[PDB]
Write a protein that binds this ligand. Structure first.
Ligand SMILES: CCCCCCCCCC(=O)N(CCO)C[C@@H](O)[C@@H](O)[C@@H](O)[C@@H](O)CO
Ligand SMILES: CCCCCCCCCC(=O)N(CCO)C[C@@H](O)[C@@H](O)[C@@H](O)[C@@H](O)CO
Ligand SMILES: CCCCCCCCCC(=O)N(CCO)C[C@@H](O)[C@@H](O)[C@@H](O)[C@@H](O)CO
Ligand SMILES: CCCCCCCCCC(=O)N(CCO)C[C@@H](O)[C@@H](O)[C@@H](O)[C@@H](O)CO
Ligand SMILES: C=C(C)[C@H]1CCC(C)C[C@@H]1c1c(O)cc(CCCCC)cc1O
Ligand SMILES: C=C(C)[C@H]1CCC(C)C[C@@H]1c1c(O)cc(CCCCC)cc1O
Ligand SMILES: C=C(C)[C@H]1CCC(C)C[C@@H]1c1c(O)cc(CCCCC)cc1O
Ligand SMILES: C=C(C)[C@H]1CCC(C)C[C@@H]1c1c(O)cc(CCCCC)cc1O
Ligand code: NA
Ligand code: NA
Ligand code: NA
Lengths: 257, 257, 257, 257
């Protein structure tokens, strides 16, 4: 099929990506201008028409891809499905957050798409650290609700309220002037609860963050190498393994020969 | 003993771990529901019955382990002793924090158990940094108590009070608007005390945290490798040492042969 | 040209750099003294005369460089152009920030100039992470303006106002006591907006910062090596590549010979 | 001299260090107890007598060292001079901070002494980053004093006041609710000043901190190795250099032989 192959090659061109990137930027600029509550009716109609035009250009773009690659081939990519959901949601009249269309900058620009991929692929490796943090938060929230809920109902009156103020305490935001000094006026030993909670959760959150950053950076760096040269660099352990194999080949020809 | 070996293999199965994991989750969910002060008497009785059931299932689980492995073999593991303490404490009627039973998720799930092990084994390596921080805190607290205790008794009136507000100052929480600008109204040179205290303690705490995270991550990564393949990767220094040994063997067969 | 070569060698001397460094420090000290609103008219005239003298010394210094290196040779350096802009701006009477002349300490001291160079050369490598953060900020600001602008106009009444309070929220500054608890009094589910915003942006900002620091440190370390020894250290991958080439040369002389 | 050699070996024993460590701890405990303003006269006299005893034990300890090693040999160590200054300052009656005697725990315990040594030896390597931060702070303080000093004299009325509130702003402490939103009520564009100041200084401070931590950890790790085994591990570049030398020796015996 020469027509399908001319469309797929048009889609894959740098100028097609640049034109779609320009329409995403324009659509996001009119949605940002539409937040201004002082616009005239004519200005609002005008900007809403550019939003309706921007959306239809994405509809033509997506339909072109579903014909050039096929339904099976298009929906086999997570980024094509993501783009399809964003544009198909707009054809649902009864949602209300059109600005999420600017996320398509991530899916459309490959260098930005590799940053997200690296962050997503790094998440499984830190799953046990995230589960440990989740476990500490849950136990702390139950303890805080039972200990301080009757005396401090706005902050600890229920599990949800305790989870919220423990997240604020973990971020160090007014943890002492705002929360723990007011609580110690009633419960003088409360520092025994909150100070170890802060020590354990700030250490665990920083471990979770560093674990993601280190892995994500190395994954994205490997993905960038593959996109440019077709392959990525081999690990230092594999480089030293191939040297050992070459050393054993030389050793074999020294005892025999 | 075929009975003991059938029980130990039942205990070590993935489905036994999955059922115990489900009971820990259920027990934690009813303890969290029991924080709600608006429940009916019947709902409270109902949830308290699920807690009593969850506890007895853990009693059967632990007793099965003490019979399949033996008293010496069971108590030779730090994680078995930890599980035993958590369940045996519940049989002590006169404590009040049943939610600590959710910590058994760490001991029961091996990937979570290796995160904790890595963090614990990393603590000795940062002991001198933690002692240095402790020494700075103690000296600062004595200085702050003597300098500001009479003028600012709520924050520095005693050693305990000074330790608490120096921990708040180290976390940067309202250190200036809340503490040091009010103190400089009376003691204009107080910034000479508090600014170097913040510089030294935030640097030392970050060193302590990074030291733990780096070591803990590498230890847990080695422990994960041993659990899957039976062995961990050798250090790069040991890889280069074995190459030098192979180089000397080739060198020996070049001068002689 | 012996005169041009004697001037260029005078300019390149350590004592010329030390004298210019002293004049930048003196100029910055008089500009700092000139901030004091309690000075006498004579003291102000005196300090303003030292500023006019300091500026003319820089004019002689720059003119000497433009004659010893030539217009093409001088303006071929980004640091010479930067120095020229700083001193030429002062000859524009109608701007108002003479203290920017102290930035010349960075351009004049080579070790400080290499720290900046390392930070600047690290920026392209983190461009996709910075663009991702920018995209999240923009989407969040539009969402916050539409959701909270009518109820909270001081913080979210317009796009600019929302960008500002989201930057404050990302820095964790009074995010809960100051912004999100007041907003949840009207919109109880606002935590669904702000807590994921904080999680995503603090992770992304830390990734952006670490990415810059790691690259900048390695670039500056390579630039320092080149300035002292004429060359920098080769990467470990290139060291292992040259060993493989030497291994293949030994392998060639083992099968043939 | 058998007497001098028996004293030096007594001084260098683990039990002498343990006894001096116990006296430093005891001295610090009585100085902390002496902060309590509710003690009786007899309790104060009692604790002050233990402080006078603790000091004299350090005087005997230091005098023993000056006789066993000699004046030249003792004062040739930075840690011996540091210990001498701390104890000799106490014999100066006219200062007031005896708690600084607890710093001797760092000088007396070798593992703690190596943490400090690693941090001190790391400082020269980050000197250009610290100078860059200092330069940004100075320029910002002059700009802030001239821009906001007349309208906001408590925070920016003078250079010293501006340096203080810029350090608070850099630590993110109430930077917006406390400082920049009150300043933007008068100067609406002030965010153009403060937001880039925060971006640049938090990045630079984190670079300064990471640079210290990374170097200090590696230096202390090398110093610990030398103290235990007499030598430290060689760098990976030097390990690969010795392999290249062995490769050239094998290459020499392949073409000739
Ligand atoms: C690592 C640092 C650890 C600091 C721990 C401080 C413990 C002492 C705190 C304390 O006793 N109070 C808090 C100070 O108000 C007193 C009140 O609970 C009552 O008066
Ligand atoms: C690295 C940054 C270091 C900043 C250090 C600032 C020192 C100056 C602080 C100062 O003198 N005051 C604090 C400002 O109120 C004045 C009051 O103590 C009195 O008026
Ligand atoms: C990772 C931690 C995640 C914590 C998430 C907390 C969610 C619950 C927050 C909540 O429901 N409220 C905030 C507490 O006031 C209640 C108010 O919105 C209304 O009453
Ligand atoms: C990277 C994030 C960068 C955020 C930058 C926000 C710029 C807009 C700030 C602004 O215009 N105002 C501050 C909001 O009050 C308005 C006031 O100065 C006047 O009304
Ligand atoms: C100074 C503070 C508050 C920081 C920096 C130091 C440490 C060790 C950790 C702190 C931290 C938090 O406490 C919370 C969050 C948000 C985490 C959202 C996902 C769970 C990020 C974060 O870096
Ligand atoms: C921005 C802040 C406050 C952070 C991030 C930057 C640095 C350098 C250090 C700061 C910090 C603290 O000051 C205190 C704690 C709790 C330590 C509990 C165990 C001793 C964690 C923490 O990361
Ligand atoms: C405890 C806080 C606030 C810190 C430390 C922990 C994390 C993960 C991130 C936080 C952070 C911010 O949220 C914002 C800025 C300024 C960024 C300006 C350029 C975009 C620096 C910064 O380190
Ligand atoms: C969340 C905050 C405030 C932290 C963590 C994130 C960053 C990037 C930097 C911040 C920071 C400061 O702004 C100031 C200090 C004290 C420095 C004293 C010596 C100059 C330590 C510090 O870690
Ligand atoms: Na903070
Ligand atoms: Na705060
Ligand atoms: Na605050």
């Amino acid at each position: 099929s020469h027509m399908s192959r001319k469309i797929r090659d048009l889609i894959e061109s740098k100028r097609f990506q640049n034109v779609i990137t320009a329409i995403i930027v324009l659509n996001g600029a009119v949605l940002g201008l539409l937040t201004d509550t002082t616009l005239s009716a004519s200005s609002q109609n005008l900007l809403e028409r550019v939003d309706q035009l921007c959306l239809t250009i994405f509809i033509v773009e997506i339909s072109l891809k579903i014909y050039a690659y096929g339904v099976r081939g298009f929906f086999r990519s997570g980024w094509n499905l993501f783009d399809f959901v964003i544009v198909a949601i707009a054809l649902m009249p009864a949602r209300t957050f059109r600005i999420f269309r600017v996320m398509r900058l991530v899916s459309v620009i490959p260098t930005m798409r590799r940053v997200v991929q690296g962050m997503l692929l790094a998440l499984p490796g830190v799953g046990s650290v995230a589960a440990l943090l989740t476990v500490v938060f849950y136990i702390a929230a139950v303890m805080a609700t039972n200990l301080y809920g009757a005396t401090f109902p706005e902050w600890f009156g229920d599990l949800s309220k305790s989870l919220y103020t423990l997240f604020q305490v973990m971020t160090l935001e007014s943890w002492s002037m705002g929360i723990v000094r007011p609580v110690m006026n009633v419960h003088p030993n409360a520092w025994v609860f909150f100070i170890p909670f802060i020590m354990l959760t700030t250490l665990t959150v920083l471990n979770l963050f560093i674990g993601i950053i280190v892995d994500a950076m190395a994954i994205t760096k490997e993905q960038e190498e593959e996109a440019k040269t077709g392959h990525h660099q081999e690990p230092i352990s594999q480089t030293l393994l191939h040297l050992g194999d070459r050393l054993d080949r030389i050793e074999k020809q020294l005892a025999q020969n």
